[PDB]
Design a protein that fits this description.
The structure is cut from a larger assembly and holds chains A (366 residues) and B (371 residues). By secondary structure, chain A is mainly α. Chain A is built from 14 helices and no strands. In chain A, helix 11 runs antiparallel to helix 12. Chain B folds into two domains: 109 residues, no CATH class; 262 residues, no CATH class. Helix content of chain B is 26%, strand content 23%. In chain B, strands 6, 7, 8, 9, 10, 11, 12 and 13 form an eight-stranded mixed β-sheet that branches. In chain B, strands 2-1-5-4-3 form a five-stranded mixed β-sheet, covered by helices on one side. In chain B, helix 2 runs parallel beside helix 10 and helix 3 crosses helix 4. Classes of the chains: A mainly alpha (366), B alpha+beta (371). The interface between A and B is small, with 4 and 4 residues. The structure holds calcium ion, chloride ion and manganese (II) ion (2 copies). The site of one manganese (II) ion has 4 residues of chain B, from strand 6. Chain B: Its cofactor is Mg(2+); Mn(2+).
């Protein structure tokens, strides 16, 4: 992922303009090869027209240039691009929201699975490790970077996510389908065992744990669904054909004709179609947005950082359920115990922007 | 008079039993001692709930303390045979009924299940079904029946059979607790009634297939003893607890095969009974833990019993050795009831004798070897 929200915190004079100077995850890094290809074909065709072609053939070539320029439609391709890219962006954001995150699970576990002893600590750590393991399994199924990090289940075992005995139980299961759901079933069994053993004190807490487990598992299933069910291939081919047809039309129809013929709208030759190159940037980059977001778990610069999320979730969940279990500072009175109003101070840098009348409603200025 | 243990505050025990026990599981190992009629038990802690009987470890005990061995090699071995849920400790704790083996892994003298299982496996295709009506008498710790006047007798028999009211049924609390405890444990208990003798009761076990009859009845007996121990009274299976015009306790055994249950199965019922007609003495010896002396006090032919010395069979004959139920006669199929076995009989001995005589066509005064 390429984060630039710090740069665009305000609508400045040169806000979006300086974003064109970035390289990592930029339009240039995605297009420059197609840009050089389009420029190469355009320059080769222009050179052939200027030198190689006969005078007789040049009249036919320029008539074909006029014909190809008449059918260069830039408006209709904008519709198919807008709709297709909007669908791809919707899928991309929903895919990000489906990342297996264990924050809800860690909060429930640390608040419901009890015991300062070795067994309670084993319960909490193993409950969160099961969710981490199912996250790792689904992500290595869907993400190329995680797969290269965990090429085999042996890599998962050496990483500490799954144990030797859990590995034997995992491989002995007779199923031809992806087994990312297995640690979730293990989580359900372990939660039921903890409730039976009294580690979970109340019936509500067990229900809350299974509700939060099914939310986590549904996110894993949703990542599998997005991975399996692509954007329909026919629609992707339609947008690609529209864009490539328009650019093939622009390659010939926008060729610089000899001004000596005096054809209208073609009485100039700048030997570089800079406005056609700007249109190429526009439409080719608009397609490149979808081409980068269509599978957001690849190795694009703007693709999701799945390995970082795995590491963060594992470390934070272990910290929260093990070192932070029932480890609280003693209850004491805050700065505003005796104060009628509870208001924090402002720094010298924020006071002169703040201290303004508080909004009470639209109807109170009558 | 109830025992000193029954006078300890039950409230207190409950408070301890309400504690969550955690990850450890209790297994109570139950076995038959050297009298062939007494049950012994002890408990071990397991790391986890066993999923089946196969997960339970073998255990051991001192046979010299159970009338089962003497001298140096008195260590005996317990091999789990049937598992049940523990009604005294609740899930996930278990009752483990075990076979007993000597130090050299030979079956113990009161281990009748070892041979009984082999016989049942031989006739497995015929699918023998059993049912036993276990009669028992509740007694105070003084050896007098529960509820009876001190050193005296209640009114004559007549109102007590299936009776209700404080003057008709004695110790129904024990009967209700036992019935529930058996249902919770997974015992195939079919019903209960108050018997003709006051403080005498009965529970039905079955239908059970093959070796399951002995396991279910023995564990049902154990639960009754353990339930009676809680109330501070004694359950006796003595075939004649009180001399005179007071009913004996029997264990009436119902028997049927796949052939007898099928349409026109009465012909196979009659064939089995005429085979039983020729082996009355062999069955009387097997139907009692001490060779038929206890059942001599019960089988007098007077109180709805038959004569121990004479065999008789008939349809709807309460006084016969073997009874064909009236409905079974009408439907021409079903089961027949052997009314000979004593209340303190070993079900492994009873079921094995019925299969040997009726299904394996065994004859003579000794059981066949290897068949
Ligand atoms: Ca991508
Ligand atoms: Cl014990
Ligand atoms: Mn009866
Ligand atoms: Mn009967």
């Amino acid at each position: 992922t390429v984060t630039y929200t710090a740069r665009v915190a305000k609508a400045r004079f040169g806000g979006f303009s300086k974003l064109l100077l970035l390289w990592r995850g930029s339009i240039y890094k995605l297009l420059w090869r197609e840009l050089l290809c389009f420029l190469g074909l355009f320059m080769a065709l222009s050179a052939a027209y200027r030198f190689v072609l006969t005078e007789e053939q040049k009249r036919y070539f320029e008539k074909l240039v006029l014909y190809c320029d008449r059918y260069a439609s830039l408006i209709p391709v904008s519709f198919v691009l807008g709709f297709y890219v909007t669908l791809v962006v919707h899928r991309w954001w929903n895919q990000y929201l489906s990342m297996p995150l264990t924050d809800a699970l860690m909060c429930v576990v640390v608040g419901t699975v009890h015991g300062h002893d070795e067994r309670g600590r084993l319960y909490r750590r193993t409950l969160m490790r099961y969710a981490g393991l199912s996250g790792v399994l689904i992500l290595r199924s869907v993400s190329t970077a995680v797969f290269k990090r965990f090429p085999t289940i042996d890599h998962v075992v050496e990483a500490g996510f799954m144990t030797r005995e859990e590995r034997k139980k995992f491989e002995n299961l007779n199923s031809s389908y992806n087994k990312y759901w297995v640690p979730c079933v293990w989580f359900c069994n372990l939660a039921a065992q903890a409730r039976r053993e009294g580690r979970i004190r109340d019936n509500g807490a067990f229900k809350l744990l299974l509700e939060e487990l099914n939310v986590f598992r549904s996110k894993c299933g949703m990542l599998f669904h997005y991975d399996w069910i692509s954007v329909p291939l026919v629609y992707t081919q339609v947008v690609t054909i529209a864009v490539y047809s328009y650019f093939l039309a622009c390659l010939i129809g926008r060729q610089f004709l000899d001004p000596a013929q005096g054809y209208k709208d073609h009485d100039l030759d700048l030997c570089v179609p800079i406005f056609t190159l700007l249109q190429f940037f526009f439409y080719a980059g608009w397609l490149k947005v979808a081409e980068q977001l269509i599978n957001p778990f690849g190795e694009d610069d703007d693709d999701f950082e799945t390995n970082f999320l795995i590491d963060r979730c594992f470390q934070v969940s272990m910290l929260a359920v093990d070192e932070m279990y029932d480890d609280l500072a003693m209850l004491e009175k805050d700065l505003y115990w005796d104060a009628a109003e509870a208001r924090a101070p402002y720094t010298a840098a924020t006071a002169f922007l703040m201290q303004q009348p508080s909004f009470q409603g639209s109807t109170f200025d009558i | 008079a109830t025992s000193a243990s029954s006078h300890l505050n039950k409230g207190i025990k409950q408070v301890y039993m309400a504690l969550p026990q955690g990850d450890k599981v209790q297994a109570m190992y139950i076995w038959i001692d050297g009298t062939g009629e007494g049950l012994r038990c002890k408990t071990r802690t397991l790391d986890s709930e066993p999923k089946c009987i196969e997960e339970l470890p073998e255990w051991n005990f001192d046979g010299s303390s159970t009338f089962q061995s003497e001298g140096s090699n008195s260590d005996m071995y317990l091999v789990p045979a049937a598992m049940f849920r523990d009604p005294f400790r609740k899930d996930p704790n278990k009752l483990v009924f075990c076979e007993v083996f000597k130090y050299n892994r030979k079956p113990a003298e009161t281990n009748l299940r070892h041979t009984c299982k082999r016989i049942m496996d031989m006739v497995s295709n015929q699918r023998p079904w059993f049912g036993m009506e276990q009669e028992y008498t509740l007694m105070g710790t003084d050896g007098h029946p529960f509820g009876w006047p001190s050193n005296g007798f209640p009114g004559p028999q007549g109102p007590y059979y299936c009776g209700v009211g404080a003057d008709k049924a004695y110790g129904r609390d024990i009967v209700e607790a036992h019935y529930r405890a058996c249902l919770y444990a997974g015992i195939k208990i079919g019903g209960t009634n108050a018997e003709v003798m006051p403080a005498q009761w009965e529970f039905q076990i079955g239908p059970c297939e093959g070796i399951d009859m002995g396991d279910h009845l023995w564990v049902a007996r154990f639960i009754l003893h353990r339930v009676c121990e809680d109330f501070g009274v004694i359950a006796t299976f003595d075939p004649k607890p009180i001399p005179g015009n007071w009913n004996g306790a029997g264990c009436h055994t119902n028997f049927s095969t796949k052939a007898m249950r099928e349409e026109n199965g009465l012909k196979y019922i009659e064939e089995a009974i005429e085979k039983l007609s020729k082996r009355h003495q062999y069955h009387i010896r097997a139907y009692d833990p001490k060779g038929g002396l206890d059942n001599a006090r019960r089988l007098t032919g007077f109180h709805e019993t038959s004569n121990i010395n004479d065999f008789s069979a008939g349809v709807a004959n309460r006084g016969a050795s073997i009874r064909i139920p009236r409905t079974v006669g009408q439907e021409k199929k079903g089961y027949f009831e052997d009314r000979r076995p004593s209340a303190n009989c070993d079900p492994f001995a009873v079921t094995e004798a019925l299969i040997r005589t009726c299904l394996l066509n065994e004859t003579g005064d000794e059981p066949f070897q290897y068949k």
